[PDB]
Amino acid sequence: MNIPPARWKLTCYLCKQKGVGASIQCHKANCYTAFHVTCAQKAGLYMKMEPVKELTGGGTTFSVRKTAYCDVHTPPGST
């Protein structure tokens, strides 16, 4: 049928399921690791947080772009 929602709820490896709250997909396109925001806070994994500021439309536009890697994504690529 004509389904307006297109929310591709990803599978959270820290769950083995999908839906419950919000999903976040880890960086690196050759990886794409999906989990929950609650899982990220729970593990305390690597999250880079870049704030973009703009004034588009004669005002202020704020977009935060978080670059996150899954917990088992940190060891691959030894810093």
d(CA 65, CA 50): 5
Residue spans of alpha helices (H) in the chain: 37-43
Does the footprint of Zn ion cover residue 68 (CB under 5 A)? no
- In whole angstroms, the minimum distance from the beta carbon of 29 to Zn ion comes to 10
d(CA 15, CA 64): 26
H or E, element range at 47: strand 47-54
- In whole angstroms, the minimum distance from the beta carbon of 37 to Zn ion comes to 9
- In whole angstroms, the minimum distance from the beta carbon of 59 to Zn ion comes to 36
Of 1-9, 44-52, 55-63, 71-79, which segment contacts Zn ion by CB under 5 A?
71-79
Neighbours of 42 (CB within 10 A): 12
Tell me which residues in 28-67 interact with Zn ion (CB under 5 A).
Answer: 31, 33, 36, 39
- Contacting positions for Zn ion (CB under 5 A): 12, 14-15, 26, 31, 33, 36, 39, 70, 73
